[PDB]
Amino acid sequence: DLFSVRMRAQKNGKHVSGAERIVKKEELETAVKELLNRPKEFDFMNVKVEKVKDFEVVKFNLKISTYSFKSPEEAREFAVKKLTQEGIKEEVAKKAVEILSKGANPKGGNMRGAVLMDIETGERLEEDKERGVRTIHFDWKDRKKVTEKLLKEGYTLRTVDALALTFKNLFCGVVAELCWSDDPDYVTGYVSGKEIGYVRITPLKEKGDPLGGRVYFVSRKELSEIIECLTQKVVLIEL
Ligand SMILES: O=C(O)CCCCCC(=O)O
């Protein structure tokens, strides 16, 4: 008997915060209390609690590494190199980089979902190409434990969330992911794949730059099951 808890908050019409937790009824209040207090300030908040029908547990099996470079250019070139080791060929991967660099949303600014890409035409397969695909319905099977472990190991709370997200993205047949934050104060991002693991890369963008986002690399041959798994399948993740 599990429940999905999905929170979103705004201030002056602009999104300020969001989170999902998947927990037993006995933890339902704890999760709702955590998400209620998450935003610093807000005008409006919606919390959507939904009982889970089907779900699957998966064990986390990615290896984490971290690399630091002197410049966004050095960092982005290294991201391209490590994508290359996931079978992506250098050309597609470098298109992903400028998209997030130049501005992922066509009409300008940041999408709040991911770019889809085939590993060949390098074109954006996402439906609403101004919002993109949002991966949802995933969580750490024991978030409090995992968060303690990874924070002690030196990672941040953003790592904790980003890890669980990619491992679902990859479990759903995304082959590799490119991501950095749109927060202008957080310049660590990552490249991710079933072979390269979770490769954290720092300065993927200049401080003060407010353009971020994700790009998922996928087989257009498979796009149907992936969007299904990304947006509808319910996955807990244990260590
Ligand atoms: O593991 C990290 O520290 C990198 C997480 C990238 C930031 C994800 C985001 O805020 O969109």
UniProtKB/Swiss-Prot annotation:
State the reactions this protein catalyses.
heptanedioate + ATP + CoA = 6-carboxyhexanoyl-CoA + AMP + diphosphate
Nucleotide-binding is among the record's keywords = yes
Lineage, top-rank taxon, reads: Bacteria
First-tier enzyme category under EC: ligase
Its pathway is: Metabolic intermediate metabolism; pimeloyl-CoA biosynthesis; pimeloyl-CoA from pimelate: step 1/1
Tell me its family: Belongs to the BioW family.
Query: What is this protein's record name?
Result: 6-carboxyhexanoate--CoA ligase
The source organism is Aquifex aeolicus (strain VF5)
Taxonomically, what lineage is the organism? Bacteria, Pseudomonadati, Aquificota, Aquificia, Aquificales
